[PDB]
Amino acid sequence: EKPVLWYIADPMCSWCWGFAPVIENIRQEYSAFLTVKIMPGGTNTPLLPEKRAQILHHWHSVHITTGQPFTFENALPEGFIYDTEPACRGVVSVSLIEPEKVFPFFAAIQRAFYVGQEDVAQLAILKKLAVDLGIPESRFTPVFQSDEAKQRTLAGFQRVAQWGISGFPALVVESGTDRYLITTGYRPIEALRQLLDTWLQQHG
Numbered sequence: 001e002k003p004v005l006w007y008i009a010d011p012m013c014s015w016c017w018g019f020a021p022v023i024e025n026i027r028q029e030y031s032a033f034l035t036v037k038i039m040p041g042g043t044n045t046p047l048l049p050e051k052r053a054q055i056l057h058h059w060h061s062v063h064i065t066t067g068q069p070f071t072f073e074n075a076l077p078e079g080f081i082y083d084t085e086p087a088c089r090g091v092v093s094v095s096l097i098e099p100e101k102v103f104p105f106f107a108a109i110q111r112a113f114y115v116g117q118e119d120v121a122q123l124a125i126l127k128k129l130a131v132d133l134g135i136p137e138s139r140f141t142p143v144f145q146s147d148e149a150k151q152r153t154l155a156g157f158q159r160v161a162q163w164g165i166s167g168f169p170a171l172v173v174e175s176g177t178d179r180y181l182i183t184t185g186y187r188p189i190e191a192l193r194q195l196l197d198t199w200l201q202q203h204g
Helices: 016-029 049-066 083-097 099-114 123-132 137-145 146-164 189-202
Strands: 004-009 035-040 171-177 177-183
Touching: 004 016, 016 035, 016 049, 016 099, 016 189, 035 083, 035 099, 035 146, 083 099, 083 123, 083 137, 083 146, 099 123, 123 137, 137 146, 177 189
Parallel strands: 004 035
Antiparallel strands: 004 171, 171 177
């Protein structure tokens, strides 16, 4: 039984998009030794101007630090509601349908949002992304709408809170009864190689 490396992230977190190439490399390099899984971790009021400016500063920081693309022209128009729950639930849904497609689906949402400017809070948008990855709408939509996907998603958020996670993206190794915090924020691949390497050396 391999230890599990939990990627604790939200598709509408900009530093998570900055970190997408890093977690891709980690998955590519460590998947013989760690099972890498996503634990996604809600609103209905318009985004306020001050808050929008903070978010856009984060996007600029991510872009210049990591090179990950953003479409800044007409970004986050007024009236936009920053509801992160449905996209998290879409990811949970794909985990129940085809676990191998979880990381590609998460990335597809991030690109559709940051570059495509698509409202990834909407089912119409999410089901299209699942179709692009070979998941039929007839499998995705019932799962997305189910109480099960809703409750699993919320249970994920609650577990993230219970684990005391204060920054995102975060990485946690869970081995048997034990959990180990690896990182709680974006860091370069070199730093995370060190951290993972030491964890595996000390644990095993």
